[PDB]
Amino acid sequence: ANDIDNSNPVVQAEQLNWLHYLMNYGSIVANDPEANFDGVRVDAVDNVNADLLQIASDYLKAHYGVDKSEKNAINHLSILEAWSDNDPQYNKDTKGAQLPIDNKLRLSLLYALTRPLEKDASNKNEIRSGLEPVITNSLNNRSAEGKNSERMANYIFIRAHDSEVQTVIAKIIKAQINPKTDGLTFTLDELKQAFKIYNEDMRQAKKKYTQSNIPTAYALMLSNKDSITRLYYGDMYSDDGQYMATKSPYYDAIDTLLKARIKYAAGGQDMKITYVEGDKSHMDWDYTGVLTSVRYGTGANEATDQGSEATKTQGMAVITSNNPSLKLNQNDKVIVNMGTAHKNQEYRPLLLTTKDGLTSYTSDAAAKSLYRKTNDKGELVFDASDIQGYLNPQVSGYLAVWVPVGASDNQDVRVAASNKANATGQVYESSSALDSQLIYEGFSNFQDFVTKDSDYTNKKIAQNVQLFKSWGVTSFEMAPQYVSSEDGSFLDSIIQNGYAFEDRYDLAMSKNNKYGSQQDMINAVKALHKSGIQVIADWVPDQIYNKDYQAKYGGAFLSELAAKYPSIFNRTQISNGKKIDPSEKITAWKAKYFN
């Protein structure tokens, strides 16, 4: 493991050369422009690598014109891995071309929904919070008093390949397999033993290790205005085993929410907590907060907006408690204001919590008899017969989603990208068009190695494109495709592909990666493009492991890039106070380019 010296202007030129290779991989290697990557995931890791964010952003502007229209920006959707303590402000202050993480809301969701109650807990900080932070503690404050400040473009997730997976396995191994584990380094046999317990724990009502209320997390993220959700592979399927071989217990609930977002999620948003009095004598944790989140549908931005009759079948309500023992007394009410656009209108449940889990309703007719009609002010009223705390595999508390009756089967409330430049001059301005995008992180670190060729991740991706389309996936984030090194160090033990590599330019070419052959990779990218889904490339310029493809392609494109995109070469970089130096090609990594 060697840290690359990204303060060196010749290295900075090589990192640009590599970015160009990844995004034009099809044209350069396969002579096939349908096998190119559309967007990039930038993972700079360290503050010393700051300059690479401006180099990447300058390339995306010059090559794709992402700064010249919303359309160009949305058609090359790019993201920033968690980097600084304020990625949104840093990306804005620099004129950067990547979506930042809404890290504040990610932590608000984890601590309000997924952590255990006080009794069954690790320490004071791993105690489940109230729901109040889910409204206010976000890059975009969604309270009545906070929603009117400038909105910031962002992506949100509850889990990822590198987030809220390994840390759970580490707990299981330390508790039950190998006390005196140092985390970080595990054997394949330790992982296999841990994943048997992990998979059992995830399917239980009482979760010792895994996250509570994952469906509730998705209901809130997918219905939120001014955000793009990144769906995690491991929330739909098992984090271990063959690719897409076993569904997660949460598959059906999240599938229901993904389809409903396309059909109903539009117009303005209001969020509110109602503190019911409660029974208390029949309650453990005394928290009586019930969160509601309403979308008004196209044409209505506020509770008082009229809308039109042609938008009546849009909008939705999410109702949630995070308290498994919540009981309303017989006088308690939760009022949900669906808006003045939704007076005297029939609503039916999409999702309801029961003793056993979540009931999903695939049509209006499936839920006839559960129909409820708003009053002349546009209010639904729920009481003790509707809302109750439950403890089941799906829910710790209560989850309901309500939708207006009468939507057509193929109703789609998503908005096309504007052809105009953003007035604010940002690459990504928060909008209904940007909210219409959804990213899928389509891999887990802990996928099993294949038994036969038919198991390969990249073959399965090409075979299931229409499933991804039905979920509203506009951007598919593929695993890093670099041929893996084989040694002691977690990225090499599980061969997650890139992350641990000896050749930056070797994408399943000297041999298969974990995910299949060069042709399997190419065909997955082509299949996704044929149904209009973008593919994101994984740009990881921090490290390299120790006549390859670095030799063939190293510095090969700098002449062409200098001729076409001079703006990239004219910038004086902040950290070293120098322009990038393309006068030397890096055809082999040596000590001179490390630290």
Residue numbers in the entry: 423 to 968, 1006 to 1054
Text taken from the publication that reported this structure:
Streptococcus mutans, a known etiological agent in the pathogenesis of dental caries, expresses three genetically distinct types of glucosyltransferases (Gtfs; also known as glucansucrases): GtfB (GTF-I), GtfC (GTF-SI) and GtfD (GTF-S). GtfC synthesizes both soluble and insoluble glucans (α-1,3 and α-1,6 glycosidic linkages), while GtfB and GtfD only synthesize insoluble glucans (mostly α-1,3 linkages) and soluble glucans (mostly α-1,6 linkages), respectively. All three enzymes belong to glycoside hydrolase family 70 (GH70), which cleaves the glycosidic bond between the glucose and fructose moieties in sucrose during catalysis. While fructose is released, the enzymatically produced glucose molecules are sequentially fused into a growing glucan chain and, depending on whether a 1,3- or 1,6-linkage is formed, the resultant product is either an insoluble or a soluble glucan, respectively.
The new structure of the catalytic domain of GtfD affords a structural comparison of the three S. mutans glycosyltransferases. Initially, GtfB-CD, like GtfD-CD, underwent proteolysis during crystallization setups at room temperature, which we only identified after the structures had been resolved since the gels after purification appeared to be satisfactory. Unfortunately, use of the classic protease inhibitors AEBSF and PMSF had no effect on GtfD-CD. When the models were rebuilt after obtaining molecular-replacement solutions using homology models based on the GtfC-CD structure and the GtfB or GtfD sequences, it was clear that GtfD-CD had missing residues; in fact, the final refined structure of GtfD-CD lacked domains B1 and IV. Our current structure of the catalytic domain for GtfD lacks domains B1 and IV (truncated at residue 421 because of proteolysis). Unfortunately, the catalytic domain of GtfD is not complete since crystallization resulted in the structure of a truncated protein lacking approximately 200 N-terminal residues of domain IV. Although GtfD differs markedly in primary structure (52% sequence identity to GtfB and 61% to GtfC), it still has remarkable similarity in its structural elements (the r.m.s.d. to GtfC is 0.69 Å for 3292 of 3959 aligned atoms and the r.m.s.d. to GtfB is 0.69 Å for 3274 of 3962 aligned atoms). GtfD in particular shows several different residues, with one prominent residue (Thr589 in GtfD) being the decider for the type of glucans (soluble or insoluble) that are formed. The truncated model of GtfD-CD is likewise similar, but our attempts to co-crystallize acarbose with GtfD were unsuccessful due to the absence of key binding residues in the abbreviated GtfD (residues 421–1054).
